[PDB]
Structures are given as C-alpha cells and as structure tokens.
Design a protein around this ligand. Structure first.
Ligand SMILES: Cc1sc2c(c1Cc1ccccc1)COCc1nnc(C)n1-2
Length: 128
C-alpha cells in the first residue's frame, strides 16, 4: 500500500557486513525464542497501518521496526555488530510503548517479549 512506508532497509551492498558470535547468538537464541512466543505474531512483520486502521501511526513512528525485518537482517547478514541488532529490538519495543496507551494489550505483549529479550541479552557472550 502507498499509504504505508517502504519497509526498513534489509539489503544494501555498500554496507559492510560481518558475522560475529554475538550476531549468531542473536539469531539462534534471541530471535528464535522470541519468534515462537504466544505474543510474537503482531511483531512478526511491519505495522500495516492501512489494514489496522491506524492512519496516524507513521506520523508518530518515524523509525519503524519489527521482528520480520530483524529476521531478514539476521538471515541475510545485514549487520556489522550485535549492538545494531539489539538497537533494532529496542526500537521495536519503544515504538510500541510510544504509540500505544500503557496497559493496552499490545503493550503487555511487547513487555512480555522484552522481558524474554532482556533475559537473553544479559547472557550475551563476549566476542571471539
Ligand atoms: C496486528 C497488530 S500490530 C499492532 C496492533 C495490532 C492489533 C492487535 C490488537 C490487540 C492485541 C494484539 C494485536 C495494535 O496496536 C497498535 C500497534 N502498535 N504497535 C503494534 C505492533 N501494533
């Protein structure tokens, strides 16, 4: 839809790429575990503001992010470091908290994914 923005970048041949043990941990452990969570489905693809009748969404959220985009960035090696990927997850959670009312169902769902995310990120291995 023309009323939805293009998705966040997932392919850019000019951007340097690098595989790190931390990035492998983010795909194998963090993304894998969050993706199967009962509350993951609203976060598995960009917010479709047209379909969901949220016409102001992209007037408020200027740095959209979702796990579908993160999954593509991890599987198609878009990142140089783990911090870029962790920032994407944090952007996804923050966008949800900014747009929605505290205590809304979608906020409780993002909070459950973030609690699981924090448990996994505290165990982030050191580089090798
Ligand atoms: C499919 C989506 S994606 C989404 C929402 C829905 C519908 C919905 C409603 C209640 C419970 C679960 C899902 C609803 O809140 C707006 C919003 N802000 N960030 C996100 C992600 N969303």
């Amino acid at each position: 839809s023309n009323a939805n923005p293009p998705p966040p970048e997932t392919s850019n041949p000019n951007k340097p790429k690098r595989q790190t043990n931390q990035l492998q941990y983010l795909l194998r452990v963090v993304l894998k575990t969050l993706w199967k969570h009962q509350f993951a489905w609203p976060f598995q693809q960009p917010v479709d503001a047209v379909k969901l009748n949220l016409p102001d969404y992209y007037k408020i959220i200027k740095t959209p992010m979702d796990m579908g985009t993160i999954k593509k960035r991890l599987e198609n090696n878009y990142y140089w470091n783990a911090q870029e990927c962790i920032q994407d997850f944090n952007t996804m959670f923050t966008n949800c908290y900014i747009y929605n009312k505290p205590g809304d169902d979608i906020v409780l769902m993002a909070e459950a994914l973030e609690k699981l995310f924090l448990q996994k990120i505290n165990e982030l291995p050191t580089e090798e």
